[PDB]
């Protein structure tokens, strides 16, 4: 679990949305497995616009930060699951690091800020959906 609060927004896993976040749904892409919903108090965090390919992510399954190389925005076929049919993935960067069920929401962040949040994993990767594109976020 864990969400970006940036401004009067709230960027969670679509897969994991509450009640409250579709009840104040502002946009929602089953694609992307990302949800932003408005918020009654000032977010904090800064999102990055950048094309870094290093980063750090926070791991809930080892309470540890991990340093990590990441690739580029990009369609990765991901299995069927209790959330999603067998499908293409969009704006999905993979990493080599550790990942299971429980860790959708972990923040991956750079130098310039927060970069996208944990979304995939499994046989020693980990999958993060990217927000970078996402500049309605800051304005
Ligand atoms: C039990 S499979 C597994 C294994 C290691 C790590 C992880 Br995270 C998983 C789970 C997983 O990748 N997904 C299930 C939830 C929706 C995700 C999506 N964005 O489509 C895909
Ligand atoms: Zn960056």
Redesign the pocket.
Known sequence: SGAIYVGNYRVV?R?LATHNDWANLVWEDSSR?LLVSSTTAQGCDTIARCDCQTGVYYCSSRRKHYPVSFSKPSLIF??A????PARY?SHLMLAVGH???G??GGILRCQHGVVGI?????NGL??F?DVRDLLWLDE
Request: hydrophobic share 15%; aromatic share 8%.
């Open positions: 896993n897969h497995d991901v299995e699951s209790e959330y999603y993935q990942s299971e069920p860790d959708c944990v979304s995939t994993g499994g980990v999958g959906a």
